[PDB]
């Protein structure tokens, strides 16, 4: 099965360099062009560059001709993007794609995307998360994760073995210029004094991975 | 730039057959294949159609899409609650020497019956009141439609300007939404003021609700 993974996201200041990586797996990459797409938080689609299976041939969009720099090695499955000279309007999501057709020098089809990596183009600086408990027929309880920079986070609970009624709400921006958000689940109140819940929260821009135990209070 | 326009929004119940129409130009549409791409809430896009009409395997054969001069159409058979997400065609463009034009996107909403909302309140954690900020934070649970009055009153005065709401995509299972909504006050403003309170009027209940603690208890 195929896969592909984007890396290289995180925040990064205007005017300043950023290089993105793609890792491919499942299908022979040396035979298929690859594409970038990218998308800003909240909107549409828009192609970014493509280069065919040996580089030989390469496209960029008009938005980025003379600034970015799209480059691949067959002997490692990976794909590249060299970005220079970053303004605001290229926070995106950078997703990596294969195409349908082999051995191909024209166009693009998308066939596979990777879930993309997220590039935040910002003044402000990297900070980690707060992560504070929203304790408790149905009860509910959550985190707070508050205060953090750029997006994202995840969240799960009890490291995955808890999905039934998670609701892990849009992150929104506060006036202070930092995200929050909040992440919480309802569950049987007769388990309150039984099941454990913890909130592993993760953001990768700071390296930061938090198990938050939630508890009702006294 | 160009775009292929598609209609911001389509909608259908359940098991009823939705459209998602995308016009072009004879440059892009009228001289190439057009893909479709179906983008759920938190995931990238997933090829959904390619050469017009052509499914991958793995895509249901309630998917269909066709071409007709410079026009696209997506109809989506038999509507699952699954089905709602944005969906985007695309298709290469001749004019300029080449360029990849994607359209503008549909959201597709699943129609239900209205649902009132379980509200939950959670006063701040002490933890996090020990670093001078109290975020008091009011939870709608699954809820239809989107549209909600969601009010704070703190010793019965109205608050403004210092809440923040947001707001889930549709579930994929049950096609209800939830809300958030945070309360933000200096540890010294919390300090000095007894009821917190978060009213809730919405479409599904006939009075709005009030869920509400005092401070310390």
């Known amino acids: 099965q195929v896969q592909l993974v984007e890396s290289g996201g995180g925040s990064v200041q205007p005017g300043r360099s950023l290089r993105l990586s793609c890792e491919a797996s499942?299908?022979?990459?040396?035979?298929?062009?690859m594409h970038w797409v990218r998308q800003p938080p909240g909107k549409g689609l828009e192609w970014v560059s493509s280069?065919?299976?040996?580089?030989?041939?390469?496209a960029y969009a008009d938005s980025v001709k003379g600034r970015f720099t799209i480059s691949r090695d067959n002997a490692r499955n990976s794909l590249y993007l060299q970005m220079n000279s970053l303004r605001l309007e290229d926070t995106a999501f950078y997703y990596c794609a294969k195409d349908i057709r082999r051995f191909s020098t024209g166009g693009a089809e998308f066939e596979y995307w990777g879930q993309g990596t997220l590039v935040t183009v910002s003044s402000a600086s990297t900070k980690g998360p707060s992560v504070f408990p929203l304790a408790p027929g149905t009860a509910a309880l959550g985190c707070l994760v508050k205060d953090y920079f750029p997006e994202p986070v995840t969240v799960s609970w009890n490291s995955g073995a808890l999905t039934s009624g998670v609701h892990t709400f849009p992150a929104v921006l506060q006036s202070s210029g930092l995200y929050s958000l909040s992440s919480v689940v309802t569950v049987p109140s007769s388990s309150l004094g039984t099941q454990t819940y913890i909130c592993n929260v993760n953001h990768k821009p700071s390296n930061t991975k938090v198990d938050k135990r939630v508890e009702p209070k006294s | 730039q160009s775009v292929l326009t598609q209609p911001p929004s389509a909608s259908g119940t359940p098991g009823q057959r939705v459209t998602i129409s995308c016009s072009g130009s004879?440059?892009?549409?009228?001289?190439?294949?057009v893909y479709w791409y179906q983008q759920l809430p938190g995931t990238a896009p997933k090829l959904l159609i390619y050469?017009?009409?052509q499914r991958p395997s793995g895509v249901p054969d309630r998917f269909s899409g066709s071409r007709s001069g410079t026009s696209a159409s997506l109809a989506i058979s038999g509507l699952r609650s699954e089905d709602e997400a944005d969906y985007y065609c695309?298709?290469?463009?001749?004019?300029?020497?080449?360029?990849?034009?994607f359209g503008t996107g549909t959201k597709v909403t699943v129609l239900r019956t209205v649902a009132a909302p379980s509200v939950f309140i959670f006063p701040p954690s002490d933890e996090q009141l020990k670093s001078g900020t109290a975020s008091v934070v009011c939870l709608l649970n699954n809820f239809y439609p989107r549209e909600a009055k969601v009010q704070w009153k703190v010793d019965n005065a109205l608050q403004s300007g210092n809440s923040q709401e947001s707001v889930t995509e549709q579930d994929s299972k049950d096609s209800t939404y939830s809300l958030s909504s945070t309360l933000t006050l200096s540890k010294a403003d919390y300090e000095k003021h007894k009821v917190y309170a978060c009213e809730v009027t919405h479409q599904g209940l006939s009075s709005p609700v009030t869920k509400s603690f005092n401070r310390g208890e």
């Open positions: 499942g299908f022979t990459f040396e035979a298929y062009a």
């Open positions: 050469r017009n009409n």
């Open positions: 004879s440059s892009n549409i009228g001289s190439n294949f």
């Open positions: 280069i065919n299976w040996n580089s030989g041939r390469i």
């Open positions: 695309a298709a290469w463009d001749d004019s300029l020497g080449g360029h990849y034009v």
